[PDB]
Design a protein around this ligand. Structure first.
Ligand SMILES: [Cl-]
Ligand SMILES: [Cl-]
Ligand SMILES: [Cl-]
Ligand SMILES: [Cl-]
Ligand SMILES: [Cl-]
Ligand SMILES: [Cl-]
Ligand SMILES: [Cl-]
Ligand SMILES: [Cl-]
Lengths: 81, 142, 142, 81
C-alpha cells in the first residue's frame, strides 16, 4: 500500500489519523490531488498552499515520487519550539 | 562530534544538560537557547516517527555549515503551562560566531520544519496556535 | 529588569547561574554564552575600577536596543588553563531574535571594550595574547 | 592632581603602574602628548594609534576634556572574553 498520516487541523478535518491507498501514484502531488477529490472536507483539508508533505519521515516537495511501501504524511505549517 | 536528540514529556534541567555539552576543551565556545511556553495550558501534538529524525537532519545540515563540537537538542511534548521550558538547544564550536549562528539556525529550522503543533485550552475550547510569517522569513534567510 | 555583573577569580557554574536567569515567565527566550580558555596557563590582567562598570554600561546599551528581561554577565580574572570557563553571558527576552542578538552584541562589545588583557606563560616566558582584527569588525557592525 | 593608570604592555613600558600630573591639560590627547614627550619609552608606550583611553572608568575619545580630580587610564586594545 501507500500509508498516509495526518496531523493537527488536517487530521481533524479529514476525520481519520491514517489510511492506506493503492500505490498507483507517480508523485506526492498526484496522491494529494487524488485524496482531495474524495470529498469536500478532504479537499478543504488537502488543498491549502501551505500544506506540508513528508515521505518516510522526511520533508519533501510535492513533486517527490512515491513507491509501494512508503509512509506519506500531510500536515499544516508547524508551530513547535 | 556526538549529538544528543530527545523528544518526550520529561522536563529537562539546563544544569544537567550543560556539563556534557561544555566538556570538551577544543569546544571553547558554548551557546545555549531555552524556549518556554508564552493563563492557559498548551498541548504540543507531534509526529512521533519524524520529530527526532527531523531534528537530527537539522543538526546534520548545521554541521556542514559550521564546524561544531557537541550539540544537544531537546524538545518536549504534552501539556505544558506558561513558564515551562519546552525546548533546549545547545551548540559548541571553537569560535562564538559559529556557535551563535548554528544556535539561531537550529531554532529557525526547528520552528518551521519539525513536526509539532501547539494547541491552547482557552475558556471557549481548544485553539490551534497560529504559525508566524516572521518564522518563515527567519528560515528563508539561511 | 535586574542585572547581575561579577568580576573575580571564583569559578562559576552555569547550573547555578541559570535558574535565576530563566525564572521570570515573561522572559520566554533564554540565551547563554560561555567562553573558555583556548598547553599553557593564561593570566587575565584587568583594570579593577572599571571592569564591572564597563560591563554594566554594555548591558545598559543592550537594554536600549532590545527589550530584555534578566541579564547576567560573569567574567573571571587570574590564572586559568585551556578548558576553564572564563566568561558567562546570559540574556533573556520575550523573543529569540533579541536574546541571540543581545547575547552576540554583549560578547562583541565585551571583547573590544572591557579592560582585560590575556597573557600566556610559554616555555620562552610570558607573552601578551594578540587582539584580533575580526573582533573589531564584529564590534563595528553593531 | 590628575591621576594616571597604565595596563598591560603600556604599564610595562612606561615602567610605573600609576602617576600624578599637573591638572593643566585641556584634553586627554593633550595629556597624552605631554606624557609621551617625557622620554623615548613613554613616547613608544603612548604613541600607538590603537592606544585606548578612559576617564573616570569610562572609555572616551582622546578629545575628551580633563578636570582636576579625574582618573585617566591608558591601555592597549583589550583581549578579554
Ligand atoms: Cl485535481
Ligand atoms: Cl507557546
Ligand atoms: Cl569567541
Ligand atoms: Cl557572533
Ligand atoms: Cl584564551
Ligand atoms: Cl522565540
Ligand atoms: Cl535569531
Ligand atoms: Cl606632541
Amino acid at each position: 500500500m501507500i500509508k498516509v498520516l495526518f496531523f493537527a487541523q488536517v487530521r481533524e478535518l479529514v476525520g481519520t489519523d491514517a489510511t492506506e491507498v493503492a500505490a498507483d501514484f507517480p508523485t506526492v502531488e498526484a496522491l494529494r490531488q487524488h485524496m482531495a477529490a474524495q470529498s469536500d472536507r478532504w479537499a478543504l483539508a488537502l488543498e491549502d498552499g501551505k500544506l506540508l508533505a513528508a515521505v518516510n519521515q522526511t520533508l519533501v516537495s510535492f513533486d517527490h515520487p512515491l513507491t509501494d511501501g512508503d509512509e506519506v504524511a500531510f500536515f499544516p505549517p508547524v508551530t513547535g519550539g | 562530534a556526538e549529538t544528543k536528540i530527545v523528544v518526550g514529556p520529561q522536563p529537562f534541567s539546563v544544569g544537567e544538560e550543560y556539563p556534557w555539552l561544555a566538556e570538551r576543551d577544543e569546544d571553547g565556545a558554548v551557546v545555549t537557547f531555552t524556549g518556554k511556553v508564552r493563563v492557559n495550558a498548551l498541548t504540543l501534538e507531534h509526529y512521533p516517527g519524524m520529530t527526532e529524525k527531523a531534528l537530527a537532519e537539522i543538526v546534520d545540515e548545521a554541521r556542514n555549515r559550521w564546524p561544531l563540537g557537541r550539540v544537544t537538542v531537546i524538545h518536549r511534548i504534552g501539556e505544558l503551562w506558561p513558564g515551562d521550558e519546552i525546548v533546549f538547544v545547545g551548540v559548541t564550536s571553537a569560535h562564538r560566531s559559529s556557535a551563535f549562528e548554528a544556535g539561531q539556525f537550529i531554532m529557525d529550522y526547528l520552528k518551521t520544519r519539525a513536526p509539532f503543533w501547539k494547541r491552547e485550552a482557552t475558556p471557549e475550547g481548544d485553539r490551534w496556535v497560529e504559525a508566524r510569517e516572521s518564522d518563515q522569513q527567519a528560515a528563508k534567510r539561511w
